[PDB]
Amino acid sequence: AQSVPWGISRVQAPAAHNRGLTGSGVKVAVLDTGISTHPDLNIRGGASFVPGEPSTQDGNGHGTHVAGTIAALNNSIGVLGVAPSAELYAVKVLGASGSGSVSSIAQGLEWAGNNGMHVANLSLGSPSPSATLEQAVNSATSRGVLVVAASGNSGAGSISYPARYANAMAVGATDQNNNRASFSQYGAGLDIVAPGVNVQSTYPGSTYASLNGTSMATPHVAGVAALVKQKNPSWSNVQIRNHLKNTATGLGNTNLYGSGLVNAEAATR
Ligand SMILES: [Ca+2]
Ligand SMILES: [Ca+2]
């Protein structure tokens, strides 16, 4: 049958689902190693920005996993995503090695802006700031896209870029008790945290797998952002953002946690 991973219950996605919020009518770009076609996924489109590589054909597994968390289908198989009806686009910016270049990340961000994406999930990062990155972060945002980015996995009391950027919602990871995960980068520019430990999701070769990483926390917020937008169609990126942070369960220290745990019930009241 279908299983509901611990993180989707934790984020309280089902309660939102009970009120009919599935993420329908919302377009989500996933900037990653690609998305492979899988029985429990609905991929609407995408593009590849990797010299040498397809799109949806993920040679890594990381993008496929990420997308699983945001939207794997509510059915009697595999898993269930936060936003089971969200329109997924595979924006391939990282190759099978799982690395890219800031330009590949920037042209993906351009794609989203020119394609009308409501959400942009960037489960990637660098210790280094980039001019080409915050610019694209910036256009995407004028164009109405909500950039969701991972804090990083060094455990440093600082955050990675694009996350550091005022222009991006920065997402850190918690473990199963709701404590920050050891690798989870915190500090300045940290907006919120979501489940990032032992997260089971969709994976190439029509299988499922468990991964750890702030890279797994990010899709959880992209998902929530989709539910709110379905419920408040008129809202802009900045509105969804502030409401997502404001309805979070405070885990009492905005330095380690930003607002606290994203909360779909609460965020959709
Ligand atoms: Ca499923
Ligand atoms: Ca930020």
Interatomic CA distance for residues 30 and 160, integer angstroms: 18
What number of H helices and E strands is found in the chain?
A: 9, 9
Compute the distance from residue 13 Cα to the ligand 1 centre, in Å: 14
Residues at Cβ < 5 Å from ligand 1 ion: 2, 40, 73, 75, 77-78
Coil/strand/helix, residue 82: coil
Compute the distance from residue 137 Cα to the ligand 1 centre, in Å: 32
**φ/ψ of residue 262, rounded to 5:** -50, 140
Q: What is the CA radius of gyration of the chain?
A: 16
Helix axes 237-246, 214-231, angle to 10 degrees: 110
Q: Is 20 left (phi over 0), alpha (psi -120 to 50) or beta?
A: left
User: Which listed ligand is nearest to 141 at the C-alpha?
Assistant: 2
Answer yes or no: is 165 a known binding residue. Answer: yes
Interatomic CA distance for residues 108 and 119, integer angstroms: 12
Quick one: which of 225, 206, 210 has its CA closest to 82?
A: 225
Interatomic CA distance for residues 244 and 96, integer angstroms: 32
CA atoms within 13 A on the CB side of 265: 10
User: Which listed ligand is nearest to 122 at the C-alpha?
Assistant: 2
Largest CA distance in the chain: 47
Task: Give the active site residue among 38, 48, 58, 62.
Answer: 62
User: Which listed ligand is nearest to 241 at the C-alpha?
Assistant: 2
> How was this one solved?
X-ray
Resolution (A): 2.4
**Cα dist from 187 to 148, 251, 260, 261, whole Å:** 17, 15, 13, 16
Choosing among 2.40.10.10, 3.20.180.10, 3.90.1150.200, 3.40.50.200, the CATH entry for 1-269 is 3.40.50.200
Domain boundaries, the chain: 1-269
